[PDB]
């Protein structure tokens, strides 16, 4: 029986509890949860919506970013479809709206309503800019839902619009948030177009965006004020074309995601994505892995972040079909030991059932957790309600776990936490 | 065994089916469902929300009226509370808003937000009129949520408001719906105050109301454009004071509602309510009753409508505690026979589980049905969702039942329907 | 199929509802529920606890009487046992206590406690009278629990008792309730012994009894102030001896109770009980029966009350084993028609599941209902709680049913009620 | 309560049993079940598969016909789709195959396999005829699956086919079943093409069809040897175009099927279908109806068969939503009384749960039953197994019911059956 006695033992979240430490924390608000998703992407909260076709599409990715997390768009769809979700997420908010929706003065109120309910943004857009033609885009005026509420379906846009000479316009393509705020206050307006030397429409700044930029300072934003979003790719020859079109559609990170990340296909994919200027301009996250040697390999291939989890859940296809997997706490412990020394953030992916588990994942070295089941069947997933409050409570649980380790930040949580193992 | 053989048999909804008749109906939209609630109150759809503390308070009464039905506010609360719900329902929409919410120019943006979220209307109000003082109410300007979105909590209302000289005002206290519509179109504004000879604020007309008055032509409205609502009273000495305060708060009908309406207390209450000018200005509905002689008595007492149903449900307190009741179809058949001859509408109250039952209730002579259980636990009741779509489907079922009797109107449904009795 | 078509149909309680009548009742308290149990026994409420070994022994019989009803002691026990329960019920309260518990001055505090917890009364007795000897019973003093609370188990009763010269005594063997009340008020005492010309103890009047006689004016009392109780006998040769010992133990009525009362054994038993002076001094109730001819026979045999019900419940031994029975409403209708004309009260026995059923039983002509299941498993039955509140709610239901028939009394309920028959 | 007492009572199948009659039947096989579907369509067994999108498409319609019944193709699909199912059913078997599948000699074995698995027939076709070109169709040879079993995907059809000079051919376009049988026996062949004066392919006769025509003499066949099938239409303007395309695709009857057949829309549709030569060449069946007057109306409109059943099932949309319907036994009794006198067959549609119910339907006057639920979830419906054995047992039950009425035929079953009504 010696061969059996020498098999090591792996621990999942349910095997351990965080041991209560000395805590100097004197206020719940002193606990900071900002963290890294990959070498070059910070997040206010360490929550990632899983790239599952039951969890993360446009609406989920928008909500996560607004909470200060991020979502990874899944790849079980056509390249065109996956880029379309991406474009919509990027369209959700901005500072300078590139290519704002326009309409022509001799179109009807019916066509205006259709323009305002554009499918390029969930919920449509708040106004249409009336310009002379699609070629030149000389700004003549503006039309909102308010301008249509008493019109007959056939009335001209020109009859109804606010003319440009009664609008507040700017030619400052570098206008600051304080500047356009002042413009909106002085002019009592809610839309400021940016036009060029000859009155041609270049951008739109909306009061709706200015308000978001002043309030939810937690949102995950790219440099243009748009919501952060990531997207997954496979490793097949065609996934490279998918990656390129995703980066061009606006992806902020790429996630190489196959069930068995400690494979030559996965490493070579990482090398490929990093070695092409069309894709090396965003961080490359790779997985899934469960061992230190795997973590070594992917890091050495160039990965900017690792996704941890092979057969993490107690009943999952990987365990029942192939018989493979690693209990997730051991896997997070083994992988982050290697990755910490290399400065590579780790996503703990799978097997998390409660906010208490998130605290253990971080305590065991992860920088973010990825959530599938806990977020499926929320409103924004493709019954549980809206995902925002679930996420906020999860972060609340984590903060509470952090205080039990006496940690005021994610690094401290990783350095300070001590586990104790249960049985029955 | 002869004494048992001579007991008559009563039928409930589940004993019968509507027999399919010859139908000339060539379109679902040819079926008209307008009906009478009482001698002087018409309704577009024959649905009444029951005066139960689990069903009908402000939100339910508002929704029913908007669907074209009505709700009866229950009396299991203080007179002040019941009038407060009434006032709020009346505040939900109007044509001329009497006593519109005001604010003073040296108040703060924080006080403006509080004014805009007034508890006198569910959802607050859409604007505040800035006037010189509460005494004189000289109109200086207007302030909306839009005007506050970039203000600091301590900024003056005067700094933020649209001044009156930039507003559209009217002195026409008799302005028509077409008139103020034109004012709103020409001026691109969404609020038109009505002021007096010296600029004192008298009324407010809002674009929000004008739009409702043009669209949902089905709503149950009093002469001022407000939503129709009724309220219940008991028969005790104090219920007369309740009735008077309810009429003065705006009730459109009073419902005398006790479990045993064929009683001297109930008749005398009806005589009392009709014999006092403070209450005889609205229709008096009375119940509950289940026999022809009872219907006779209440009509003779002066009732403008009868509410039918004593022990209507298969398992209800009345049957289990007292052992009394009448199967509801027989009760509707007996009572409406008497009432039809007298021109007195009948509410079939209780025992309705499906839209099919509503069709039988009407088929058996009722002019309206009252719904408790089917409407409890909707959003607007104090999980099923919003009540609007449930009501719309119920009316859909009724229209379908009407077509099976080949009826294009409620009268025809009552005159044409024939029943067949089931068993096992 | 003609032979089947001619079988008559019988109705149980669940086939009918009381039809709501015109009610002049202007207050719940105007409804009087007093009724007759037998020709010579009135009751404040028409509730009888069934003579079942799971329902009615001493504690149940006491509670029913205190509520204003009565219990029938069951006969499934030895004559000695059944008389013992009877004696205890009679011992529960009185005006003049015959043979009050005594003790001798040289007995110990331990023996006093044992005397005070006499098993002849549930709860023991409130005091012991200290007399000179069992033969003469010359009153020397009184001892209560209060007098023992600081005594050692071996202290003499004489050391602890209140001596007679400090007591309030009376020689008035005909003392009235107002008289002894005055004695108790002037003397601040709670026990007044009645002694004879030579100081020999004859009776005891206790403040506890005086208080009951002033408060619960609803209790069912015999002429001596004791609780009313009845007892059941069979029809075998030995049941005559049981009847005689029961009457002598204090029974106020005898109930001849066999499953098939329309039998020669039952009639002859009634003739026997009525024809013997040892038993003809209390009313003779007989049953069980379900037909008019049976009611005729027993009345003609001399019965002072009939107990109605043969196979009354839907699942009972009589129906499943023998296949016999009558639906209980028909049985009550048939039997009381005969009995009303003869002035013989009827107990509706069995098949009652709710207070609504009690109202139907009375409505169908019964003068009392007998309850088994509804009272079993109450505290006073040999989990539901105490029987008092269950009984009070049952009477409440009946009063409510009475108001639906517009009846202010039991006779009116019987004369006025009208039924309607249900189906599905 | 008089108005309730006068409502008539309707019976469903579960209210009655067939009364056993004197039976002279001396063998199960003496019971003949042939019947009429409509004035001009006979069936060997009275079973019709309901025109429900869960029951009857191509496979169901084929199986029913082979059992000797018929299926009605449902209309919840596009005209093109409904005709496509029709064409396939007609393609299932034939005597002379019109337009048999061909192939050209220089096509490949791969293209032959694709031809043999044509989607125009469930299961494909048994051979391809090799002809010179699509224009002329000069027969050069024949190719079957057997001819391909050792070929490489690129081998020429010409290399593999049996050449025409080794085939058995006929020029007899009127060849009888005995004639072509003899040809197949003498020539040991399984396919006999019919060619014209110049060797052009006109028809194909297959051994597979000859065998079916000799064995299952019960099948429902049109004059060409194809399986009988019917199709449903609505009453909207476009259903006339659907009817015309269905007749042209080969429909043997049309079924006008709306929930409320006693309507002007339905009558006018019947008049329309009968008054157009494009549709008056097949029988017009109409429904659904439940009254004698309705039966009168449709017959008078010209209907060749009535479909009986409005709200036939205990829990169906019609009863729960509209509250309408007729217990199905009464409805069959009322309608067939009228229709018998006019020679118009009746389909009892709905509410049948067991083969015993089928016997009652026939006993009550129906000529056929329509089955939905009992046939859904069989293999041939779009788990219960194959529909053939279920149908055969149903017919077995009916034959047994027929023997209990002592009937040797459907007419006798209708004339002889007597019902008895149950209760609990
Ligand atoms: N007006 C306008 N808004 C756009 C456009 N594209 C994206 N948006 C976004 O849509 C929002 C428009 O304003 P609203 O309609 O008030 O949106 P909301 O209040 O968040 O709902 C802003 O957040 C814009 O950044 C566009 O082309 N025109
Ligand atoms: N502005 C204003 N509205 C009022 C007042 N009282 C009731 N209302 C009603 O509240 C609504 C105000 O407009 P909104 O805030 O846009 O309401 P909504 O769009 O229905 O939500 C109108 O329907 C008014 O009739 C009031 O005092 N001021
Ligand atoms: N003291 C006394 N009470 C008796 C006797 N027999 C019956 N009782 C009854 O028991 C009660 C005695 O008083 P308490 O001990 O206060 O009884 P309780 O307050 O009802 O408990 C009275 O109701 C008496 O009628 C007796 O022999 N002596
Ligand atoms: N060979 C052939 N058969 C056809 C064609 N169209 C329909 N069929 C039918 O398909 C069957 C072909 O024979 P098999 O392939 O043996 O069919 P099966 O044995 O019933 O399976 C016959 O019943 C034909 O009537 C056709 O174009 N060619």
Which stretches does DSSP call E strand in C282-327? 283-289, 305-308
Phi-psi region of C302 (alpha: psi -120 to 50; beta: other; left: phi over 0): left
Provide the token pair at C226: 């004791």
Chains that touch B (3 or more CB pairs under 8 A): A, C, D
For residue A121, give the ligand 1 atom closest to its CA: 7
Question: Which positions ≥6 away from D123 have C-beta within 8 Å?
Answer: none
β-pairing verdict for D128-131 and D102-103: parallel
Instruction: Give the integer Cα–Cα distance in Å for B182 and B214.
Output: 13
Chains that touch A (3 or more CB pairs under 8 A): B
Residue found by looking up tokens 């390249």 in the block: A79
Residue found by looking up tokens 């409620």 in the block: B410
DSSP-derived 3-state class of residue B356: helix
Instruction: Give the integer Cα–Cα distance in Å for C178 and B86.
Output: 59
Instruction: Give the integer Cα–Cα distance in Å for D113 and A394.
Output: 59
Examine residue B280 and say whether the peptide bond preceding it is cis (omega within 30 degrees of 0).
no
Q: Which ligand is nearest to the CA of C123?
A: 3
Instruction: Give the integer Cα–Cα distance in Å for A348 and A365.
Output: 9
For residue B101, give the ligand 2 atom closest to its CA: 27
| Resolution (Å) of this entry | 2.5
CA distance readout (Å), D212 to B221, D208, D220: 73, 7, 12
β-pairing verdict for D201-206 and D191-195: antiparallel
With beta carbons under 8 A apart, name residues in chain B contacting A162. 188
Instruction: Give the integer Cα–Cα distance in Å for B45 and B67.
Output: 8
Question: Which positions ≥6 away from C294 have C-beta within 8 Å?
Answer: C261, C262, C335
Of D4, D320, D327, the CB nearest to B354: D320
Q: Which ligand is nearest to the CA of A191?
A: 1
Count of positions (residues) in chain A:
424
With beta carbons under 8 A apart, name residues in chain B contacting A188. 147, 162
Question: Which positions ≥6 away from B129 have C-beta within 8 Å?
Answer: B100, B101, B102, B103, B139, B141, B142, B193, B201, B204
- Name the residue of D97, D189, D225 to mutate for ligand 4: max ligand atoms within 8 A of Cβ: D97
Instruction: Give the integer Cα–Cα distance in Å for D309 and D255.
Output: 14
Q: Do B184 and A150 touch (CB under 8 A)?
A: yes
Per the annotation, binding residues of C for GTP are 91, 101, 121, 126-127, 209, 212
Output the residue whose Cα is nearest ligand 2's atom 23: B93
Closest CA to B340 of B372, B308, B313, B370: B308
Q: Cα angle at C368 between C362 and C372, to 5 degrees?
A: 110
Query: CA-based diameter of chain C, in Å?
Result: 90
What are B263's strand-pairing partners?
A: C23
Please report the sign of the dihedral spanned by the C-alpha atoms of residue B101, residue B105, residue B110, residue B113: positive
Closest CA to C367 of C89, C1, C37: C37
Q: How many CB atoms lie within 10 A of CB C299?
A: 21
Count of positions (residues) in chain B:
424
Provide the token pair at D369: 């039953």
B351 is in an annotated binding site: yes
Instruction: Give the integer Cα–Cα distance in Å for C117 and C100.
Output: 13
Our answer on whether the CB atom of A180 is closer than 6 Å to any ligand 1 atom is no
Closest CA to C33 of C417, C403, C416, C423: C403
Which stretches does DSSP call E strand in C145-229? 162-163, 191-195, 201-206
Contact present, B321 and C354 (Cβ < 8 Å): yes
CA A287 to chain centre: 18
β-pairing verdict for D305-308 and D283-289: parallel
Closest CA to D412 of D401, D397, D423: D401
Contact present, C93 and C226 (Cβ < 8 Å): yes
DSSP-derived 3-state class of residue D249: helix
Q: How many CB atoms lie within 10 A of CB B207?
A: 19
Contact present, C191 and C206 (Cβ < 8 Å): yes
Provide the token pair at C78: 């030895």
Contact present, D21 and D412 (Cβ < 8 Å): no
Instruction: Give the integer Cα–Cα distance in Å for C256 and C86.
Output: 17
- Cα Rg of chain A (Å, integer): 25
A283 is in an annotated binding site: no
The chain B residues in contact with chain A (CB within 8 A) are 146-147, 149-150, 162, 181, 184-185, 188, 190, 207, 210-211
Q: Which DSSP string corresponds to B270-306?
A: HHHHHTSTTTTTSEEEEEEE-SHHHHHHHHHHT-SEE
Q: Do B294 and C20 touch (CB under 8 A)?
A: yes
DSSP-derived 3-state class of residue B9: strand
Provide the token pair at D98: 């019109």
Contact present, C38 and C285 (Cβ < 8 Å): yes
Provide the token pair at C292: 């008019």
Helix A292-301 and helix A328-340, axial crossing angle in degrees, nearest 10? 40
With beta carbons under 8 A apart, name residues in chain B contacting D291. 19-20
With beta carbons under 8 A apart, name residues in chain B contacting D319. 17, 356
Residue found by looking up tokens 């001798």 in the block: C104
Instruction: Give the integer Cα–Cα distance in Å for A77 and A85.
Output: 10
A268 is in an annotated binding site: no
> How would you list the strands of the sheet with B102-103, edge to edge?
B102-103, B128-131, B139-143, B162-163
Provide the token pair at A226: 């748009």
Of B14, B262, B422, the CB nearest to C20: B262
Instruction: Give the integer Cα–Cα distance in Å for C152 and C112.
Output: 12
Instruction: Give the integer Cα–Cα distance in Å for A96 and A204.
Output: 6
**How close does chain A come to B362, measured CA to CA in Å?**
37
**Technique behind the model:** X-ray
DSSP C319: I
Instruction: Give the integer Cα–Cα distance in Å for B63 and B86.
Output: 13
- The torsion angle over the Cα atoms of residues A328, A332, A335 and A339, rounded to 10 degrees, is 160
Contact present, B256 and B269 (Cβ < 8 Å): yes
At residue D231, φ and ψ (nearest 5 deg) are -145, 150
Provide the token pair at D228: 């009988």
Q: Which ligand is nearest to the CA of D212?
A: 4
Query: To probe the interface with D, which of B5, B9, B12, B17 has the most D CB atoms within 10 Å?
Result: B17
Chains B and C form CB pairs within 8 A to the count of: 127
Contact present, A209 and A94 (Cβ < 8 Å): yes
DSSP-derived 3-state class of residue A121: coil
Q: Looking at A121-215, list the stretches that DSSP marks H as alpha helix, in order from N- to C-terminal side.
A: 145-148, 157-160, 177-187, 207-214
Q: How many CB atoms lie within 10 A of CB D248?
A: 12
Q: Give burial (CB, 10 Å; 0-12/13-18/19+) of A255.
A: buried
Provide the token pair at B76: 């299991």
DSSP C373: T
**How close does chain B come to A73, measured CA to CA in Å?**
31
Provide the token pair at C200: 């020999």
- Name the residue of A206, A214, A226 to mutate for ligand 1: max ligand atoms within 8 A of Cβ: A206
Instruction: Give the integer Cα–Cα distance in Å for A198 and A190.
Output: 23
Provide the token pair at A379: 């409103």
β-pairing verdict for B16-18 and B419-421: antiparallel
Phi-psi region of C207 (alpha: psi -120 to 50; beta: other; left: phi over 0): alpha
Instruction: Give the integer Cα–Cα distance in Å for A78 and A81.
Output: 5
DSSP B318: I
Instruction: Give the integer Cα–Cα distance in Å for C127 and C154.
Output: 19
Instruction: Give the integer Cα–Cα distance in Å for D100 and C109.
Output: 120
DSSP-derived 3-state class of residue B200: strand
- Cα Rg of chain C (Å, integer): 25
For residue D100, give the ligand 4 atom closest to its CA: 27
Closest CA to A43 of A352, A279, A257, A305: A305
DSSP-derived 3-state class of residue A298: helix
Count of positions (residues) in chain C:
424
Q: Do A185 and B210 touch (CB under 8 A)?
A: no
Provide the token pair at B246: 């309810």
- Name the residue of B125, B145, B203 to mutate for ligand 2: max ligand atoms within 8 A of Cβ: B125
Instruction: Give the integer Cα–Cα distance in Å for C163 and B300.
Output: 77
Contact present, D287 and D256 (Cβ < 8 Å): yes
Number of H helices and E strands in chain C, helices first, is: 16, 19
Instruction: Give the integer Cα–Cα distance in Å for A403 and A359.
Output: 10
Instruction: Give the integer Cα–Cα distance in Å for A412 and A419.
Output: 15
Of B1, B260, B323, the CB nearest to C8: B1
Contact present, C193 and C129 (Cβ < 8 Å): yes
Residues in contact with ligand 3 by the CB-under-6-Å rule are C 91, 93-94, 97, 100-101, 121, 123, 125-127, 204, 206, 208-209
Residue found by looking up tokens 């003073």 in the block: B104
Contact present, C287 and C308 (Cβ < 8 Å): yes
Contact present, A86 and A232 (Cβ < 8 Å): no
Q: Give burial (CB, 10 Å; 0-12/13-18/19+) of B423.
A: middle
CA distance readout (Å), C390 to C70, C73, C221, C354, C355: 15, 20, 21, 11, 10
Provide the token pair at D162: 């049996």
Provide the token pair at D104: 């050209």
Count of positions (residues) in chain D:
424
At residue C208, φ and ψ (nearest 5 deg) are -55, -45
DSSP-derived 3-state class of residue A72: strand
Closest CA to D359 of D290, D311, D417, D408: D417
Closest CA to D189 of D204, D176, D199: D204
Which stretches does DSSP call E strand in B123-238? 128-131, 139-143, 162-163, 191-195, 201-206, 230-233
DSSP-derived 3-state class of residue B208: helix
DSSP-derived 3-state class of residue C30: helix
Closest CA to B72 of B288, B292, B217: B288
Instruction: Give the integer Cα–Cα distance in Å for A274 and A268.
Output: 10
CA distance readout (Å), A282 to A232, A234, A244, A246, A247: 13, 16, 11, 11, 7
Instruction: Give the integer Cα–Cα distance in Å for A112 and A128.
Output: 8
Q: Which DSSP string corresponds to B171-185?
A: --TT--HHHHHHHHH
Q: Which DSSP string corresponds to A306-343?
A: EEE-SS-SSS-HIIIII-----HHHHHHHHHHHHHTTT
At residue D230, φ and ψ (nearest 5 deg) are -120, 170
Q: Do B1 and C330 touch (CB under 8 A)?
A: yes
Contact present, B115 and B121 (Cβ < 8 Å): no
Q: Looking at C29-127, list the stretches that DSSP marks H as alpha helix, in order from N- to C-terminal side.
A: 58-67, 79-90, 109-116
Output the residue whose Cα is nearest ligand 3's atom 14: C126
Q: Looking at D151-204, list the stretches that DSSP marks H as alpha helix, in order from N- to C-terminal side.
A: 157-160, 177-187
Q: How many CB atoms lie within 10 A of CB D355?
A: 19
HSE, CB side, 13 Å, CA atoms: give it for residue C387.
Answer: 31
């Amino acid at each position: 029986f010696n061969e059996s006695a020498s098999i090591p033992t792996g621990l999942t979240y349910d095997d351990v509890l965080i041991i209560p430490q000395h805590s100097r924390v004197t206020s719940r608000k002193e606990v900071n949860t900002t963290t890294r998703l990959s070498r070059n992407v910070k997040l206010s909260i360490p929550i990632v919506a899983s790239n599952m076709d039951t969890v993360c599409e446009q609406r989920m990715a928008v909500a996560m970013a607004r909470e200060g997390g991020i979502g990874i768009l899944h790849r079980f769809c056509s390249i065109e479809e996956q880029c379309a979700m991406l474009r919509e997420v990027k369209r959700a908010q901005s500072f300078l709206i590139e290519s704002p929706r326009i309409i022509l003065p001799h179109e009807t109120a019916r066509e205006a309503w259709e323009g305002l309910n554009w499918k390029g943004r969930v919920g449509g857009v708040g106004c249409l800019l009336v310009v002379n033609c699609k070629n030149e885009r000389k700004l003549l005026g503006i039309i909102t839902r308010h301008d249509l509420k008493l019109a007959d379906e056939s009335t001209t846009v020109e009859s109804l619009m606010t003319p440009v000479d009664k609008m507040v316009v700017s030619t400052n393509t570098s206008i600051s948030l304080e500047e356009v705020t002042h413009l909106m206050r002085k002019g009592r307006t809610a839309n400021v177009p940016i036009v060029g030397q000859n009155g041609q429409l270049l951008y739109l700044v909306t009061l709706s965006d200015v308000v978001k930029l002043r309030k939810n300072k937690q949102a995950s934003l790219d440099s243009r004020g748009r919501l952060l979003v990531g997207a997954a790719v496979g490793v097949k020859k065609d996934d490279m074309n998918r990656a390129i079109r995703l980066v061009e559609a606006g992806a902020d990170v790429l996630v190489v995601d196959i069930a068995h990340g400690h494979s030559d296909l996965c490493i070579n994919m990482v090398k490929r994505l990093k070695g092409d200027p069309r894709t090396a301009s965003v961080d490359i996250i790779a997985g899934n892995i469960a061992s230190a040697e795997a973590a070594e390999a992917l890091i050495d291939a160039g990965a900017d972040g690792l996704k941890i989890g092979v057969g993490p859940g107690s009943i999952c296809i990987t365990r029942l079909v192939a018989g493979a997997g690693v209990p997730q706490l051991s896997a997070v412990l083994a992988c982050t030991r290697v990755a910490r020394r290399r400065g590579v953030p780790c996503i703990a992916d799978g097997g998390l059932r409660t906010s208490g588990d998130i605290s253990k994942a971080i305590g065991a070295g992860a920088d973010t957790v990825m959530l599938g089941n806990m977020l499926a069947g929320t409103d924004e997933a493709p019954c549980k309600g809206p995902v925002g409050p679930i996420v906020r409570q999860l972060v609340g649980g984590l903060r509470s776990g952090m205080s039990y380790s006496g940690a005021k930040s994610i690094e401290e949580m990783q350095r300070r936490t001590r586990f104790v193992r249960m049985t029955g």
